[PDB]
Amino acid sequence: ISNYINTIPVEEQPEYPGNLELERRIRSAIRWNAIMTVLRASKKDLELGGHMASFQSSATIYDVCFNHFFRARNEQDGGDLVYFQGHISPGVYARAFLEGRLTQEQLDNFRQEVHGNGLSSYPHPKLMPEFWQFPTVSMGLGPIGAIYQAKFLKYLEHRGLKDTSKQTVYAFLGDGEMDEPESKGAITIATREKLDNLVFVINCNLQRLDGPVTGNGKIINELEGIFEGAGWNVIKVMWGSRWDELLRKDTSGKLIQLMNETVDGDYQTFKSKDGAYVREHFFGKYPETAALVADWTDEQIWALNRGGHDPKKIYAAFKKAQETKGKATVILAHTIKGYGMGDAAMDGVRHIRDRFNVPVSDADIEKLPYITFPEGSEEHTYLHAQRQKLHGYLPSRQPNFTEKLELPSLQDFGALLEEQSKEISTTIAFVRALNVMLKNKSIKDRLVPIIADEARTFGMEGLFRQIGIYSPEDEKGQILQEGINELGAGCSWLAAATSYSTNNLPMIPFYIYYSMFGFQRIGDLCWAAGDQQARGFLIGGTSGRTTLNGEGLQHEDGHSHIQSLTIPNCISYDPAYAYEVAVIMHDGLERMYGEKQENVYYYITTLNENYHMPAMPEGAEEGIRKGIYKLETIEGSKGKVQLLGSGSILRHVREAAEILAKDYGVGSDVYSVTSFTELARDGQDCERWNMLHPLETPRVPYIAQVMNDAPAVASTDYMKLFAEQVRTYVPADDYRVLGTDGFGRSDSRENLRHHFEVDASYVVVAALGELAKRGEIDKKVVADAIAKFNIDADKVNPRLA
Amino acid sequence: ISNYINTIPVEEQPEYPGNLELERRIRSAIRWNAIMTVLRASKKDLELGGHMASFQSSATIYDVCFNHFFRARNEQDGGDLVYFQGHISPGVYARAFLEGRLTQEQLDNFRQEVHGNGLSSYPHPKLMPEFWQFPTVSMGLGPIGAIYQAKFLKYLEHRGLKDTSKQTVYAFLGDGEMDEPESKGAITIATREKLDNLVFVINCNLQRLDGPVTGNGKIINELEGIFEGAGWNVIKVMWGSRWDELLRKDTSGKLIQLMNETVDGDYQTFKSKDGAYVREHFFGKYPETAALVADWTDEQIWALNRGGHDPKKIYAAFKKAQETKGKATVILAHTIKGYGMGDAAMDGVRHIRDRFNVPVSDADIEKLPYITFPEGSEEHTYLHAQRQKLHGYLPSRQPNFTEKLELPSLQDFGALLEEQSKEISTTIAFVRALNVMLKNKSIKDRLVPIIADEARTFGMEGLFRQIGIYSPEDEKGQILQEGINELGAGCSWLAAATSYSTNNLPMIPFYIYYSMFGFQRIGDLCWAAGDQQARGFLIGGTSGRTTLNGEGLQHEDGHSHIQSLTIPNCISYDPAYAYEVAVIMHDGLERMYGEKQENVYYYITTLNENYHMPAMPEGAEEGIRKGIYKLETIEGSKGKVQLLGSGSILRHVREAAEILAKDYGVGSDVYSVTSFTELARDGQDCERWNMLHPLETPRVPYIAQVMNDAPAVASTDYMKLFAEQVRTYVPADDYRVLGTDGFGRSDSRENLRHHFEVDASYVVVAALGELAKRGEIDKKVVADAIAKFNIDADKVNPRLA
Ligand SMILES: Cc1ncc(Cn2c(C)c(CCOP(=O)(O)OP(=O)(O)O)sc2=O)c(N)n1
Ligand SMILES: Cc1ncc(Cn2c(C)c(CCOP(=O)(O)OP(=O)(O)O)sc2=O)c(N)n1
Ligand SMILES: [Mg+2]
Ligand SMILES: [Mg+2]
């Protein structure tokens, strides 16, 4: 940790290239418009919300960037990728409006979007697909997402995919936000990969929402110490030019000491006082210091500003960051929260109007008007001149990539559609589908297989020889290995899955990991990924509660599908067979990267268990994509039932169907449910349409179109709700659901399949139980089956076990 | 960072206190038994799994701690809290067996626990409630969990609740694991809080699972750099004692420069070779280094070992960490993964038996026999003698606290059961409930309110002046303010929620935060919390998709309940009224901290919306607990329906009921569903039991004992699956569910509840639609309602919007 003064001495500070006075004129109008936007929304009294004090402390930092650094998307690259602090959006909206990119009506619709012409509270690409790019309001996700974005940009270059060398990734963070584990949790990665195309701009106003980050300490010193220890280039922007001659004057080194020894809380207090308090309490600590401002009007004292408010001091830091190579730079900008708001952080409105010399007369001020710069005006000229010199305006977003990809047809996945000689798993099927894609000229180099240490478990190690491991194992390596870091890998996946828009270069990621450590461990990023319109594939390997049998409690995933079904634009599947994964993967590619360019991403759970893989029934394609199709019908004169299964459990309900037919003469319809969730979504859609169109003929849910009314039983490797979610749509009077509710534990697949009551014997007993209720069979026969199958009717509910 | 040598010089290292010779024998026996355990499970060929290489690399570190450092739970405190690395469990089981705490049958039942006498793969309290304490296999959770456990212990001491001053928290981590953002993302807090009762012990064998952590780097240096930069005391245990002379006679400084410049990849290459190789490639790099070992035989060179394998080196670091105050300490133990296993890294195991001079014949080697030390043997005496000196054996866990608390009665919350004066929200109701508790003499100081920055949003800023904010606002402050760090807040919550077991001091944490950042953001921690038998309350504030109306996409929670229902021992509630919040909180208090000592934790979503809070209907208590109760029935001569609601949407369902009655003559039964999830679970339990007891009297779902068969409609601020989850158990033929499926956006509550098709208007059209279908009313009546209510029957499905 260095002294509590700027990192760059004024002697090494470059000349500021802009018109300081004209820029302040433009900056003040933006400040005013930002405040009017939030104030106008406030007037509605609809509890709309919005922030003001934050952008007030960082406006000048953004201002210098928009005028002298931020490159907009251009013919060569997507420009600088700016991860704007989410809640300073009113300021971004204020500038866009001034640039004529947003209308007055839109600003008046701030935080009112449902009707079509409003603005989102925060950066939400899904809501404003041509404006916002990176979802940052969920603190912590911005810094790590940016780190991996910077890394992915380097990847594109090294692979020779695109020259991203002129792109800088900027993460604008708050100091309170750095407390999130994800904020500093991955910073050593920027050093490892020498990400000199990444700049962290932490706005150090010393306060978070309900108070100061560390009132008893020095947050800027803590930040410096850890980022410096992490090998980052640290630039502290502490004081404005006014301090320059003061420090130069101080030969006793007492100012540095006072500055160094004063704690956050104190500094924050001074800020709420007056020149008198400072000179007395601050400067009054030592005579040597008091004697510096001794000849200072208290108003001269109170005039000393924090470095984050001085453009000249801000410019030096960004110019230096821009020049630095070999590592990432973090700029710690010292600011005042609620800067120039005084009263805050109509009398207060008159205050900021005066404070920033805003061009609004006393006759207009009560109208809370927005300010605009006419064409031909000095301000209008400069505002656009600076941006044009920087390639245009940002934030901006292109929702669809321009190129046409020549995707592999399903036929190209032929070998997977046929019966397998060897017993394999859906994971081996996945790796094989990847290889089919690796032979496709058009997308072969666009594929981005991602791993988090474990490859062997997923039999991914065979790909290493064919495509290599990105290791700037060389800079041309194609597979991204992120180590034991599920969040970081999800971030690389997000960078690749949204590359089609950000860089207009579609990249198709395939991130495979232990399914349990998916939505459960990185769920907030998965939700933000949907916001970011990510188009890619998340592969939850070693899935199913009873299939990853030895690992136990914190590994056995019998619910990721319950977690995944909560994301609107995530398409989840739990295939049982290899031909299904091929059909599913092919459909995803087509939907997402085909001409449709559907803003959706895929989640496919795959297995680590091998078994016979039959050939795809002819014409089963549409059903597989839809989520269900009848596998076969079995004859039986004693009765009829329908049996549904998915994943590794389908194999077991299929065995229950043979037992039922053989030992009980009960026939059945066997269905492979590739997606209980897509089927649930379809039923809901039909029911909603029906409810909304009372005079129209009721639409029939696909699952209801596929199934009949015979008593049904379903079993899967997930908790019962996974299959229960389609109850409303099952056309049978009876629909029993077996599932793996309860905490996992270590044992053999067989022992677990019995414990969780999802094996063949339970399916048979469940099927028999319904026919018994119908009067088709004697209750005694089901009671004997329970006995016959060594089933403990009185063992604790697995959910409780 | 510092030189690549041991932090502690020999002249400063203390005399080893134990019998190294005897200790090696015992250690070798534990090494053997651990491998026999995993190998024996392997023989079963049931894909049970288990690891061996990892524990082989860290065995001596644990051995020195078990012999001279670890304090077992005792009469005064819970002893040292050790977060044992997850996959080295075979080594912990091997020692427990040698200590006579585990039987050979149990070891023989390693990873086969479904039947009663087996052992879990990893540390899982829920599965082995009296053995394991902290769930660590999900990497990253243990380090951050440990930091907040150390902080909580301090908290207990500052608040005067318990002198935890003699307890040390050890987090045994892997170097690969440190890549998880959660691993280093919060190390800065240990310095902030001066956690000199926290010791991070990172096993630096330089490799993850599928390779080195950073082959082209030095993770020990990286680790050292960031931890020291974060203010921690870092102690490096690099080289064994054989290096001392070499380093001491090397006056040129070349050996250090060589050690310093060598990257991890080459170091690892050295251990796969032999002495000759090292002599040429490592020492042969320079004439001065080559000369240090010129007099050595390739064997004497091959014998040079890593510090983490030398008891004397290990001991010095743990001892030194023991006298370090004012901050936490990180011990970087340098080891060899797959140590002593050589080749591997039946009879091929005879190599390790040779390697560690294991006392088992080459004829019995194939039998994979366990080693034990007979009562009276020098080894047996020393093993137990060392432990007794340290208060016994660990790990061990106590499932229930011993003291009896005098919990508040429901009557004590009487004011909350009456009709409320002003319009308040369920969050105000929650804070008021907390205050009732804070007046209880028995539990007032056992309460642990936890907030992540935001307090005023939840009106918690009012408890500050009352109970204070913990600051070691003083050190006796009760409220834990964890800033913008949801994971850290949940870790403090976890430490508190399980203090009843680890310290036999029941503490009752109430963590309130923006619901969206609960399970979605810290779900892996939440799952581990259930594994750790956590007893506390998680309060999801500003919950509901349409209720936190202005915030939008990344804040509007309409699915946290779908995530929370995936955890078996978490009880979820979505109350609409203040009296319900009181009954649920009282019930949870009694269930968890009452005589019942039920291992479950609660999840209550609360609102930021104010509306009329009615008086609790006499006798509604049990129904509120169970999940549903009839609020009232409204008369209607034209038809009848059932209307269900929860949270903030219930009042709109009641509004729909009046509309139906007043505008259409349709009567209804209105139900308040406090917990759709608990009703589903109950129904699932009923049908499961029914299926398993076919000859017996069928069990009726509680919801079927409340509802009747009139067409039903339900609406909640959550996606449709939240209410649809009870379909199977709803006794009505028609059951329409309205929900907030889809991404959130900014707008007014009114506009949002209409966009998400969940307001009174949609409930009325849904109910009327059901009657028209029954021929009960004209289809034109529903069509006109849709018109009357300005409903867009053809707008896009909110899920797709
Ligand atoms: C994960 C998460 N937690 C909490 C919040 C709530 N929140 C919080 C806690 C804010 C305080 C921001 O403090 P900061 O120091 O990061 O930045 P500023 O002081 O510059 O605003 S702004 C905001 O929306 C959030 N958006 N995301
Ligand atoms: C969150 C998470 N991700 C992945 C794994 C899988 N995993 C991984 C990736 C291991 C490698 C351990 O590497 P390490 O360096 O932390 O430890 P050792 O070298 O001492 O074994 S052990 C293991 O079970 C896990 N348990 N938890
Ligand atoms: Mg701040
Ligand atoms: Mg390792």
Widest CA span in chain A: 107
Backbone torsions φ then ψ of B484, nearest 5 degrees: -80, 80
Atom 12 of ligand 1: nearest residue by CA position: A208
CATH number of the domain where residue B721 is located: 3.40.50.920
Q: Closest by alpha carbon to A153, among A502, A528, A598? A: A502
CA B630, CA B703: separation in Å to the nearest integer? 11
**If phi over 0 gives left and psi between -120 and 50 gives alpha, with beta otherwise, what is residue B692?**
alpha
Annotated binding site of A for Mg(2+): 175, 205, 207
Query: Is cis: bond before A698, omega within 30 of 0?
Result: no
What's the B565 CA to ligand 4 centre distance in angstroms? 35
What stretches of B438-518 show up as alpha helix (H) in DSSP?
A: 461-467, 486-497, 499-502
> Which residue type sits at A298?
D
Bridge partner residues of B199 (DSSP): B170, B329
Q: Which residues contact B239 (CB under 8 A, 6 or more apart)?
A: B5, B6, B247, B304, B305, B306, B307, B310, B313, B334
CB B552 within 8 A of CB B742: no
Residues of A whose CB is below 8 A from B552: 111, 113, 120-122, 124, 127
Phi-psi region of B160 (alpha: psi -120 to 50; beta: other; left: phi over 0): left
Give the three-class secondary structure for A632. strand
Q: Are B423 and B391 in a shared domain?
A: no
Do B97 and B184 share a domain, yes or no?
yes
> Which domain-ending residue is among B402, B431, B463?
B402
Q: After which residues is chain A broken (C to N over 2.5 A)?
A: 345, 472
Please tell me the distance from the alpha carbon of residue B757 to that of residue B744, in angstroms, as a whole number: 13
Same domain? For B610 and B716 the reply is no
Q: How far apart are CA B68 and CA B70, in angstroms?
A: 7
Instruction: Please tell me the distance from the alpha carbon of residue B346 to that of residue B364, in angstroms, as a whole number.
Output: 9
Helical packing angle, B20-43 and B53-68, nearest 10°? 140
**Integer CA distances (angstroms), A691 to B639, B762, B798, in order:** 18, 9, 15
Both B713 and B773 in one domain: the answer is: yes
d(CA A576, CA A590): 21
Interface test with A, best of B745, B758, B789, B791 (most A CBs within 10 A): B745
Q: What residue's CA is closest to ligand 2, atom 27?
A: B138
- What is the CB neighbour count within 10 angstroms for residue A410? 17
Asked if A551 lies within 8 A of B691 by C-beta distance, the reply is: no
Rounded distance from Cα A158 to ligand 1 centre (Å): 36
- CA A226 from chain centre, in angstroms, equals 25
Residues A389 and A475 in one domain: no
Contact A184, B188 (CB under 8 A): yes
* SS3 labels along A6-36: CCCCHHHCCCCCCCHHHHHHHHHHHHHHHHH
Residue with tokens 């892997």: B174
CA dist B496 and B509 (Å) reads 6
Q: Which amino acid is at B112?
A: Q
Residue that is last in its domain, among A380, A402, A424: A402
For strand A480-481 and strand A508-514, is the pairing parallel, antiparallel, or unpaired?
unpaired
Count: domains in chain A: 3
User: What does DSSP say about strands A570-573 and A601-605: parallel, antiparallel, or unpaired?
Assistant: parallel
Same domain, B353 and B440: no
R_g of chain B, CA atoms, integer Å: 31
- Could you tell me how far CA B138 lies from the centroid of its own chain? 9
Q: What is the number of residues in chain B?
A: 801
Q: How far is A89 from A230, CA to CA, in rounded Å? A: 30
Instruction: Report helix, strand or coil for B500.
Output: helix
Q: What are the DSSP calls for B602-638, one per residue?
A: EEEE--S--B--PPPPTT-HHHHHHTEEEEEEE--SS
Q: How far is A610 from chain B (nearest CA, A)?
A: 12
Look at residues A657, A565, A650, A641 and name the one whose alpha carbon lies nearest to residue A603. A565
Residue B212 near ligand 2, beta carbon < 6 Å: no
Q: What is the DSSP string of B393-449?
A: -SS---SS--S---PPPSGGGHHHHSPPSS-B-HHHHHHHHHHHHTT-TTTTTTEEE
Beta-carbon contacts of residue A294 (< 8 Å; ≥ 6 apart): none
> In sequence order, what are the residues at sequence separation of 6 or more whose Cβ sits closer than 8 angstroms to the Cβ of residue A71?
A79, A80, A166, A167, A168, A390, A391
Running DSSP on this structure, what letter comes out for residue A278? I
Q: Are A350 and A408 members of one domain?
A: no
CA of residue B255 to ligand 4 center, whole Å: 25
What residue type is assigned to position A683 of the chain? G
What are the two backbone dihedrals, phi and then psi, of residue B294, each rounded to the nearest 5 degrees? -55, -30
- Does a cis peptide bond (omega within 30 degrees of 0) precede residue B395? yes
A453 close to ligand 2 (CB < 6 Angstrom): yes
CB B193 within 8 A of CB B154: yes
- Give the Cα separation of B100 and B104 in Å (integer): 10
Experimental method: X-ray
| CATH number where A499 lies | 3.40.50.970
Calpha distance A74→B305 (Å, rounded) = 57
Same domain membership, residue B347 and residue B259: yes
Are B417 and B388 contained in the same domain? no
Separation between Cα atoms, residue B280 and residue B192, nearest integer Å: 47
Residues 6+ apart with CB under 8 A from A24: none
CB contact at 8 A, B798 and B747: no
Q: Residue B727: which residues within 8 A CB-CB, separation 6 or more? A: A724, A727, A728, B735, B737
Query: What does the block give as tokens for A566?
Result: 């909560």
Degrees to nearest 5, angle at CA B155 with B152 and B158: 160
Distance CA A622, CA A541 (A): 24
Please indicate whether residue B214, judged by its CB atom, sits closer than 6 Å to ligand 2: no
Quick one: DSSP state of residue A797?
P
Q: Which two tokens stand for residue B172?
A: 């045994």
Query: CA-to-CA distance for A476 and A474, rounded, in angstroms?
Result: 5
Q: B502 and B81 in contact (C-beta within 8 Å)?
A: yes
Please give the structure tokens belonging to residue B590.
């009694």
Does residue A240 sit in the same domain as residue A312? yes
Specify whether the CB–CB gap between B563 and B520 falls below 8 A: yes
SS3 B33: helix
Beta bridge partners of A196: none
**CB contact (8 A) between residue B550 and residue A121:** yes
Give rounded-to-5 percent helix, strand, coil for chain B: 45, 10, 45
Choosing from A402, A430, A450, the residue where a domain stops is A402
Distance CA(A537)–CA(A625), nearest Å, equals: 15
SS3 content of chain A, % helix, strand, coil (to 5): 45, 10, 45
| Other CB atoms within 10 A of residue B280 CB | 13
Whole-number Å distance between alpha carbons of A31 and B239: 60
H/E segment holding residue A644: strand A639-645
Task: State the helix-helix crossing angle for A486-497 and A519-531, rounded to 10 degrees.
Answer: 20
DSSP string, A104-172: HHHHHTBT--TTSS-B-SS--TTTSTTT------STTHHHHHHHHHHHHHHHHHHTTS---TT--EEEE
CA A691, CA A778: separation in Å to the nearest integer? 41
Residue A19's identity, in one-letter code, is N
Backbone angles phi, psi at A454, to 5 degrees: -70, 120
What's the rounded Cα separation, in Å, for the pair A137 and B516? Answer: 12
Q: What is the resolution of this structure in A?
A: 2.1
For residue B677, the SS3 value is helix
Radius of gyration of chain A (CA): 31
Angle at B350 between CA B346 and CA B355, to 5 degrees: 150
Same structural domain for residues B634 and B594?
A: no
The CB density around residue B630, as the number of other CB atoms within 10 Å, is 16
Query: Distance between CA B336 and CA B647 in Å, rounded?
Result: 56
Residues B96 and B372 sit within 8 Å (Cβ to Cβ): no
Which ligand is in closest contact with the Cα of B122? 2
Q: Residue A739 corresponds to which tokens in the numbers above?
A: 């599932």
CA triple B607-B611-B615, angle to 5 deg: 100
Write out the residue range of the structural domain in which residue A458 sits: 403-620
Give the span between the Cα atoms of A196 and A168, in whole angstroms.
8
Question: How many angstroms does the Cα of residue B195 sit away from the middle of ligand 1?
Answer: 26
| H/E element, A530 | helix A519-531
Alpha-carbon dihedral sign for residues B137, B141, B144, B150:
negative
Residue that has been written with the tokens 């229960």 in this structure: A724
Same domain, B458 and B387: no
CB atoms within 10 A of CB B399: 12
CA atoms within 13 A on the CB side of A567: 31
Helix (H, G, I), strand (E, B) or coil at A754: helix
Bridge-based pairing state of the strands A628-634 and A666-673: antiparallel
Q: Which of A209, A213, A222, A332 to mutate to test the pocket of ligand 1 (most atoms within 8 A of CB)?
A: A209
* Nearest Cα to Cα of residue A735 among A718, A751, A723, A722: A723
**Tokens of residue B242, six digits:** 């054989």
Please give the Cα distance from B399 to B533 (Å, whole number).
9
- Please state the φ and ψ torsions of residue B402, each to the nearest 5 degrees: -90, -35
Is residue A209 within 6 Å of ligand 1 at its C-beta?
yes
Chain-centroid distance of CA B543 in Å reads 22
Q: Is residue A709 within 8 Å of A731, Cβ to Cβ?
A: yes
Please choose, from the candidates B144, B171, B111, the residue with its C-alpha nearest in 3D space to the C-alpha of residue B488: B144
3-state secondary structure A563-625: HHCCCCCEEEECCCCHHHHHHHHHHHHHHHHCCCCCCCEEEEECCCCCECCCCCCCCCHHHHH
Question: Strand, coil or helix: what is A538?
Answer: strand
User: Residue B727: its chain A contacts at CB < 8 A?
Assistant: 724, 727-728
Q: Kindly report each contact of residues A267-274 with a partner whose C-beta sits within 8 Å and lies 24 or more positions away, as own/partner.
A: A267/A206, A268/A206, A268/A207, A268/A212, A268/A215, A271/A336, A274/A298, A274/A302
Q: Which residues lie across from B602 on neighbouring strands?
A: B537, B571
